[PDB]
Symmetry: none
């Protein structure tokens, strides 16, 4: 997608949290990043495991919230997981 | 729409934070977050709303707000305020 | 301790003689709030806490928002007895 | 450990924050906070410890840290890390 390429291009090299969304706008994964640019882009290039590739297949859009520090990105991450209870956070949590 | 509620709506800032909508008994019945507390809180008492949100609205006699320095902080505050007050309408307005 | 209390928001942890955190509260001003416990009249529920309070510490915060978030994290950490039973 | 852990202990910062102790597997097994990450992390690998803490020390293969900027933040971060990782020694050492 074109809108999506543009979103990816102007991603900041800043810490924060990203929210992956499906076609219908439902949050499906929440993550923390030391660099939002590096982490969000990493989902749209290279190779990933089977369970992560399924996440990747469902990604229609994303959003992010910049924080002042890695410490604040961690805190925000856990609060956003509580708020949205995203399907891929529970599925991808344990090992394998 | 009592006078006390009008005077409180007039002071809302153009700042992020959270709001705590309250009974005519003073109990917190909804917690939400806003990038602009002014726009968001005022939106409840003007225009149209869905049937469920209408019921919350008819239950509001008061509100409190807590300003944050950032949206990120508003979101952290929101989830802590929900845990603290376990509000009715956070359960019921759930998708 | 009471004399050095600052006029800043934050959280205070009221403690036992035995050293346990028996209540966690949030203050817009630590100075006023903490001192208020040992002055004026008091409701019964609050009076019991006071007789039990042997010591305390506080954590200052930069905002009321931060004090609220801190409060809930401290309550989770310590699960103080009087927070359970002074349910407002 | 060998050269790696010693160097990694050498470059701990004199900054407050939370530390994450990890086992050989990479799993977070303990979360704590410190006014000095350098002082607190190093203390696990030096001196004497009680029985409970020696079991933890025996299992540490690595560590990570997150620097904080206030007493309030460090506490909040700590509680959030514990929730995230549910570390076994936070359970056993409580
Ligand atoms: Cl939190
Ligand atoms: Cl040091
Ligand atoms: Cl982490």
């Amino acid at each position: 997608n074109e809108r999506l390429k543009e979103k990816l291009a102007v991603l900041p090299e800043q810490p924060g949290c990203y929210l992956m969304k499906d076609k219908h706008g439902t949050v499906i994964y929440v993550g923390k990043a030391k660099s939002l640019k590096e982490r969000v882009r990493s989902y749209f290039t290279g190779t990933h495991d089977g369970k992560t590739q399924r996440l990747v297949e469902e990604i229609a859009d994303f959003e992010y919230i910049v924080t002042s520090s890695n410490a604040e990105a961690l805190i925000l991450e856990m609060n956003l997981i509580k708020k949205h209870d995203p399907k891929y956070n529970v599925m991808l949590k344990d090992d394998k």
